[PDB]
RNA sequence: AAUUAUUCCCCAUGAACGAGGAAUUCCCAGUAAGUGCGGGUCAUAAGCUUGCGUUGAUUAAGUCCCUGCCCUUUGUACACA
RNA sequence: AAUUCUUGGACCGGCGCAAGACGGACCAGAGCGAAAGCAUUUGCCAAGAAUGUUUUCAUUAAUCAAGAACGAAAGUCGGAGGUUCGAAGACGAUCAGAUACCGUCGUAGUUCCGACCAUAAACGAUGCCGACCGGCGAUGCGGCGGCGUUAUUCCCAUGACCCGCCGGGCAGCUUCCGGGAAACCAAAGUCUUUGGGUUCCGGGGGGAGUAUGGUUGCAAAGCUGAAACUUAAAGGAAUUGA
C-alpha cells in the first residue's frame, strides 16, 4: 500500500483478466507481470441471489468495489484481458463483460489497451450434451 | 413428397461429412447443413463507446473487434429467427438478403 | 454541468412501447453546426427548442 | 488478521536495450524474512508488452514476452523469452476465398538459444481478377511451405538473438519470405506469426548486462 | 283495501362514511362531468330507462406494449374440421 | 434451485510437468475413392482417373446364377490404455405422477493392436453399358490458342491474372424437346408411332419379415421364408377449408 511512483503524471498499469461467464462475472486486477494478485471481486460476492450473479448489475458493483479497492494500493490504469468460457463450451463474452469494462472506466480507472484471451482450441475433446444437444 | 432439390444441405459429391456441434445446444448436424453465421462486434457496445474513448491512455487506438463464428442446427436457427419459413417459390432464392446498413 | 439550449430541426417518427415519444434530430443553439438525435415526450413541433441536462448521450437511429 | 499489502514493496523492470522506451511498468513482491527470498520468487516472471508500448507509438497487432532473468537492485533486468500475434489481428487476417500457408521450423542461435518460429502466409487475390476464390495448387503450397522454412531457418542460425530480435521489430523476414514465393503465387499477409524459446543456454551476467546497454 | 310501513307532509331519532385493497368500466369537443326538465310504466308513481336544454373542461392527432379481431406465408395423418 | 466442490485454501491469475483424445478458423452446393469413407508437417512404399499421342496388341468386349474382396455406427472375445464424453446405474429438481426432458456423479463403451458380426433413411429413397435430342453462365483437373497486366529486371522462359476453344468430372440456371397422376425430371425424354444389350426385383392392406426347416456366428443375431385367419379399402400428388 505504498507505490514509489511519484503521482506527476506516471501512470502505474495493473491489467484486469475480465471473465465474463453466462452464470458469473469474475473482475480481477493484477500486477504487470500477471502473478501477484492485487484484488479480486467475484460477481456473486456483491448480490446474495445465485440467479444473477452474471448480471449487468453485479458486475458493475464488484468493477466499482475493485476501482476502489485498486485506487487504495496505487494502481492508476489498467489494462483490460477480456474471455469467454472457451474450450468446448460458448465463446461470446457473458452479458456482465459490457457493465464491468464499462463501471470501472467510469470509475476514474484509465485504461491502456484491450485484447481477448478466451481459450479456444486448434481442436478439442467431445463436448457436454448428447449427440442431440440440450432438448429443453 | 421431396421438398428441396438440393437435400437442405450443401453435399452434392461426397457421401460423408464430418459433424458440427450446434452452439446452443450440443446436438451433432453435418458441416455443410448447419447455418454458419460470421459474427465481428466491437469489445465495447456503443455508449460505453464514449466512456472509454475519453477514459483511456492513448491517444487515437482503434480498440479491436471480436470475432465469432456461430454453427446452429435448424432447430435453434429457427427458434433464434436467424432463418424463418419462406413462400415455396421464393424459398429458390439463394440470394443473402441485403445488409447495406 | 451547463444545461444547454438545442432547436430542433425535423421529425423523424415515433417510438417507445406505446409510441410515447417523438424521435427528432435537435441542432444546438450555441454551436452551429451539432445535431444529434433524441427521444422527446409531449407534443414537440418542428421549429421549436429543447433544454438539455445533457449535451452529449444520443437517441439510437430506429 | 493481516494487511496483506502491509509487507509488499514495489520494483521497476528495465527492458532490454533493442526497444526504445525501458521502463517497462511496476512489480510487487514481499521482501525477504527467511528461506522463501525476495529475488529468489522475482525470478522467473514472464511479461507480455505490446510493441507500441515497447517503442513510442507503433504496432498494437504484436506482442513480446520479457522474464526477470535476475533482479540488480530496485530494478528487474528481463530478457527476449517469446513473440505472438494478437487475437484480433490473427482473426482479421484468417478470411474466406483463399489459401492459407502456415510453416513451422526449430534452429538454433549462435549463443545457445534455440527458437520454433511459426510463419503464416495467404494467396493474394490479383488486381483485374474476375475469378472470385484464387487459391494455390497442392505442390505450389509446399513449394512457398519450402521456402518459408529455408528463409526462417538462414536467417536466424547464422547470428545471434540480439540480431534476431532487431529483425523481429519490423517484419522483415516476413517481408523476404513475401518476395521469395512472388513467382510460385503472390501472398500479402505473411508474418513471422509466432516464437517459442525451447532451450536457453548457460545464465552468464555479463551477455545480459551488455544487452541491457 | 296500505298491516309486511303505497305515495306525500311535520316534529322527533342523528347511524357507517376522513375519498375507498386486489382489480376494473366509460370517454377525445358543445364531448366527459355537474345540473335540473318531459315521455314510458301510471288509479297511486322514479334512486330505472328514454329524450331535452343548461354550465362546460384536463389530456391526444399516436402505437401495436397489453386485450381482441382480420389478413398473408407456412405445416398438417384434421374435414361431425 | 438443489445434489457436488471449498479456510486439510475450491474458483480466478502465473510458471512449469504428464496423459490420452482431437486436427478449429482456411472449408466451398470444391476435390479424391468401388461404396463405407477421407483434412496439421515431412519422409518412404505401391496404386489411380482425366488429359496428350501419326506408340503397341487386334475383338481381347457389356451385363452376370455359382463363388469372392471391402463394408459407418452399435455389439462380442483377447492384450494394452484410460484425457474427454457417457447406455447402465446413484441421486437432485420439476410433475397430479417421471421410471423422461433439465442438473452433479458415473461402470460398460468411446482410443490403439488382433480375431469376429455383415447391417443403416448403407439415399440420388433413382442398377450397369451404348447411341440420339435445346440454350446460357460459371466451376475442378489436362491440353491448346491469343491483346494486355505483374515476378524472375536480362526477360528467352517458366509461375499469378485476363479472353476464348477442346475433352472427362461435381453441380447450377432457363424453355411448350418431350414425358408424367402430379410434385417435378435434359432425364424420370426418344412408349399404343409400344423391340439397342443384360442382372436384380414388385403384384390390395394386414397376419409378418412372424411360425417352421436349413444354413452362418462364441453370443447378439444375419441370409432364405410361408399358412390359417381378418379386411374394403390402405395409399400417392395436388386443391379448397379448419
Ligand atoms: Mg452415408
Ligand atoms: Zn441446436
Not at chain 3, 417518427?13 to 417523438?22: A, F, H, M, N
Not at chain 3, 418542428?46 to 445533457?54: A, C, K, R
Not at chain 4, 506469426?193 to 548457460?202: A, D, G, Q, W
Amino acid at each position: 500500500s505504498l507505490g514509489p511512483q511519484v503521482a506527476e503524471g506516471e501512470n502505474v498499469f495493473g491489467v484486469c483478466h475480465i471473465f465474463a461467464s453466462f452464470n458469473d462475472t469474475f473482475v480481477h486486477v493484477t500486477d504487470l507481470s500477471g502473478k501477484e494478485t492485487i484484488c479480486r471481486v467475484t460477481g456473486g460476492m456483491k448480490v446474495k441471489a445465485d440467479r444473477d450473479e452474471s448480471s449487468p448489475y453485479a458486475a458493475m458493483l464488484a468493477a466499482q468495489d475493485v476501482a476502489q479497492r485498486c485506487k487504495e494500493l496505487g494502481i492508476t490504469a489498467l489494462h483490460i484481458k477480456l474471455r469467454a468460457t472457451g474450450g468446448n463450451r460458448t465463446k461470446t463474452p457473458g452479458p456482465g463483460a459490457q457493465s464491468a469494462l464499462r463501471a470501472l472506466a467510469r470509475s476514474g480507472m484509465k485504461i491502456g489497451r484491450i485484447e481477448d484471451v478466451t481459450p479456444i482450441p486448434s481442436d478439442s475433446t467431445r463436448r457436454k450434451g448428447g449427440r442431440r444437444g440440450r432438448r429443453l | 413428397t421431396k421438398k428441396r432439390r438440393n437435400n437442405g444441405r450443401a453435399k452434392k459429391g461426397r457421401g460423408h461429412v464430418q459433424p458440427i456441434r450446434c452452439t446452443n445446444c450440443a446436438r451433432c448436424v453435418p458441416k455443410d447443413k448447419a447455418i454458419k453465421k460470421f459474427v465481428i462486434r466491437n469489445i465495447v457496445e456503443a455508449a460505453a463507446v464514449r466512456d472509454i474513448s475519453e477514459v483511456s491512455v492513448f491517444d487515437a487506438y482503434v480498440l479491436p473487434k471480436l470475432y465469432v463464428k456461430l454453427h446452429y442446427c435448424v432447430s435453434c436457427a429457427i427458434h433464434s429467427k436467424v432463418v424463418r419459413n419462406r413462400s415455396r417459390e421464393a424459398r429458390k432464392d439463394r440470394t443473402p438478403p441485403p445488409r447495406f446498413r | 454541468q451547463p444545461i444547454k439550449l438545442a432547436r430542433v430541426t425535423k421529425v423523424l417518427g415515433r417510438t417507445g412501447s406505446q409510441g410515447q415519444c417523438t424521435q427528432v434530430r435537435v441542432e444546438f443553439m450555441d454551436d452551429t453546426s451539432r445535431s444529434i438525435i433524441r427521444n422527446v415526450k409531449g407534443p414537440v413541433r418542428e421549429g421549436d427548442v429543447l433544454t438539455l441536462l445533457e449535451s452529449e448521450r444520443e437517441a439510437r437511429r430506429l | 488478521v493481516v494487511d496483506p499489502f502491509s509487507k509488499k514493496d514495489w520494483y521497476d523492470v528495465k527492458a532490454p536495450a533493442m526497444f526504445n522506451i525501458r521502463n517497462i511498468g511496476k512489480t510487487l513482491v514481499t521482501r525477504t524474512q527467511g528461506t522463501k527470498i525476495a529475488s529468489d520468487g522475482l525470478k522467473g516472471r514472464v511479461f507480455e508488452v505490446s510493441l507500441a508500448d515497447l517503442q513510442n507509438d507503433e504496432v498494437a497487432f504484436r506482442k513480446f514476452k520479457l522474464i526477470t532473468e535476475d533482479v540488480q537492485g530496485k530494478n528487474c533486468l528481463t530478457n527476449f523469452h517469446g513473440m505472438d500475434l494478437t487475437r484480433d489481428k490473427m482473426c482479421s487476417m484468417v478470411k474466406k476465398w483463399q489459401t492459407m500457408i502456415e510453416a513451422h521450423v526449430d534452429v538454433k542461435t549462435t549463443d545457445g538459444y534455440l527458437l520454433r518460429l511459426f510463419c503464416v502466409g495467404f494467396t493474394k487475390k490479383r488486381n483485374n481478377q474476375i475469378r472470385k476464390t484464387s487459391y494455390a495448387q497442392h505442390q505450389q503450397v509446399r513449394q512457398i511451405r519450402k521456402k518459408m522454412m529455408e528463409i526462417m531457418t538462414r536467417e536466424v542460425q547464422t547470428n545471434d538473438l540480439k540480431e534476431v530480435v532487431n529483425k523481429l521489430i519490423p517484419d522483415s523476414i516476413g517481408k523476404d519470405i513475401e518476395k521469395a514465393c512472388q513467382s510460385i503465387y503472390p501472398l500479402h499477409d505473411v508474418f513471422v506469426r509466432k516464437v517459442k524459446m525451447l532451450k536457453k543456454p548457460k545464465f552468464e551476467l555479463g551477455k545480459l548486462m551488455e544487452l541491457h546497454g
